[PDB]
Design an enzyme around this catalytic site. Structure first.
Site, PDB file in Angstrom:
ATOM      1  N   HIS A  79      91.147  90.410  -0.078  1.00  0.00           N
ATOM      2  CA  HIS A  79      91.486  91.715  -0.657  1.00  0.00           C
ATOM      3  C   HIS A  79      90.225  92.568  -0.761  1.00  0.00           C
ATOM      4  CE1 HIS A  79      95.114  89.470  -2.059  1.00  0.00           C
ATOM      5  NE2 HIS A  79      95.692  90.558  -1.535  1.00  0.00           N
ATOM      6  N   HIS A  83      90.795  94.852   4.535  1.00  0.00           N
ATOM      7  CA  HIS A  83      92.230  94.827   4.215  1.00  0.00           C
ATOM      8  C   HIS A  83      92.767  96.257   4.010  1.00  0.00           C
ATOM      9  CE1 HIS A  83      96.070  93.733   2.558  1.00  0.00           C
ATOM     10  NE2 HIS A  83      95.776  94.216   1.361  1.00  0.00           N
ATOM     11  N   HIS A 117      95.095 100.857  -2.394  1.00  0.00           N
ATOM     12  CA  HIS A 117      96.105  99.976  -2.988  1.00  0.00           C
ATOM     13  C   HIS A 117      95.586  98.658  -3.581  1.00  0.00           C
ATOM     14  CE1 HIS A 117      96.263  97.503   0.602  1.00  0.00           C
ATOM     15  NE2 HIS A 117      96.961  96.617  -0.109  1.00  0.00           N
ATOM     16  N   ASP A 228     101.208  96.289   3.896  1.00  0.00           N
ATOM     17  CA  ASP A 228     100.446  95.271   3.146  1.00  0.00           C
ATOM     18  C   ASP A 228     100.464  93.908   3.830  1.00  0.00           C
ATOM     19  OD1 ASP A 228      98.780  94.414   1.059  1.00  0.00           O
ATOM     20  OD2 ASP A 228     100.357  94.279  -0.428  1.00  0.00           O
ATOM     21  N   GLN A 280     103.858  78.842   5.723  1.00  0.00           N
ATOM     22  CA  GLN A 280     103.920  80.060   6.545  1.00  0.00           C
ATOM     23  C   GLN A 280     105.353  80.282   7.025  1.00  0.00           C
ATOM     24  OE1 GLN A 280     101.419  82.599   7.584  1.00  0.00           O
ATOM     25  NE2 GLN A 280     101.172  81.813   5.508  1.00  0.00           N
TER      26      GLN A 280
END
Ligand SMILES: COc1cc2nnc3n[nH]c(C)c3c2cc1OC
Ligand SMILES: [Mg+2]
Ligand SMILES: [Zn+2]
EC number: 3.1.4.17
Length: 328
Positions: A79, A83, A117, A228, A280
């Site tokens: 993050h 990103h 964000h 995102d 995943q």
């Protein structure tokens, strides 16, 4: 307070010119910013100018805002600033492929919301901050981090020479800041599940209407999730390398929990890496594939994100069957 860019940093950005070869690549959904770190602030300026015109922001204020946003992202494994720019590029490609469905105000607000964000993310989840009663969890009861990211975005805009929106009329200002607030809260994955089910029912029944503000907010919400998570829409080696960064951050949190005497969830446990291919698979089936399926039904030009996500699900299934080649 907030960290501020140096005069050299924003002046350096003002004179940035993008290589002509990159102008073609940037339009594509699969574009990976990874190999162009020195050009990331410059790629955002180019995106803004291509989406909202060359004069949409006072070039000087835009360059200062960008370099101070960069300075308030931390050196965490996932993050981080990379990103932010990756998320903003996916929003750019969505907006370019559906340009007049959105107003100039929404485009400005959404590109900036994507860059901001995850501002000041510490590499710790909402679960950690709540479980260990961090002050942030006391100030913000739900969507803890997301309410903090927005609070951080307003603070940068509040710096001298950083308010890129100060020239908007009183009404469109309040409107843009609300677009931004809603966009950032929508990036809390907890809210995604309910958002996608509400959107799927509206679509299947034909009640979905983009002129209905409540519907518009939910569509923008799904767009925020889609951006995102866009690491699952890249060419497989890029998807796999970002997954390494994502898990490196989860494992650091899990390491912090073990130090505190708490066994983390298997996903945050670095002694449970064999469970990653199956996890995943669960993430794509429950989160990624449904997100892009719904986004594609609503905005048909976003079909490449879905196609690429389906191809990456195939690759994860190939990993489980022990058929993978390469590495690095
Ligand atoms: C590539 O697989 C993943 C990507 C992700 N991206 N963003 C995320 N935010 N919160 C969570 C839990 C995320 C996440 C989880 C993933 O697998 C479990
Ligand atoms: Mg976030
Ligand atoms: Zn994010």
């Amino acid at each position: 307070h907030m960290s501020i860019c140096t005069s050299e940093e924003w002046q350096g950005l003002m004179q940035f010119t993008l290589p002509v070869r990159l102008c073609k690549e940037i339009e594509l959904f699969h574009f990976d910013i990874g190999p162009f770190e020195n050009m990331w602030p410059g790629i955002f300026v180019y995106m803004v100018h291509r989406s909202c015109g060359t004069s949409c922001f006072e070039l000087e204020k835009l360059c200062r805002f960008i370099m101070s946003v960069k300075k308030n992202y931390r050196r965490v494994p996932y993050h981080n600033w990379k990103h932010a720019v990756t998320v903003a590029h996916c929003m750019y490609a969505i907006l370019q492929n559906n340009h007049t469905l959105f107003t100039d105000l929404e485009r400005k607000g959404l590109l900036i919301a994507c860059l901001c964000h995850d501002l000041d993310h510490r590499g710790f989840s909402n679960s950690y901050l709540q479980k260990f009663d961090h002050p942030l969890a006391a100030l913000y009861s739900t969507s803890t981090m997301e309410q903090h990211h927005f609070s951080q975005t307003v603070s940068i805009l509040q710096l001298e020479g950083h308010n890129i929106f100060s020239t908007l009329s009183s009404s469109e200002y309040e409107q843009v800041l609300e677009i931004i607030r809603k966009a950032i809260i929508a990036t809390d994955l907890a809210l995604y599940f309910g958002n996608r089910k509400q959107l799927e029912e509206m679509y299947q029944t034909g009640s979905l209407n983009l002129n209905n503000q409540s519907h518009r907010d939910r569509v923008i919400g799904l767009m925020m999730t889609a951006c995102d998570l866009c690491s699952v829409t890249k060419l497989w080696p890029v998807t796999k390398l970002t997954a390494n960064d994502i898990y490196a951050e989860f494992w650091a949190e899990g390491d912090e929990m073990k130090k505190l005497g708490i066994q983390p969830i298997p996903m945050m446990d670095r002694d449970k890496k064999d469970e990653v291919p199956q996890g995943q698979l669960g993430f794509y089936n429950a989160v990624a594939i449904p997100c892009y399926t719904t986004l594609t039904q609503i905005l048909p030009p976003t079909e490449p994100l879905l196609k690429a996500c389906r191809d990456n699900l195939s690759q994860w299934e190939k990993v489980i069957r022990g058929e993978e080649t390469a590495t690095w």
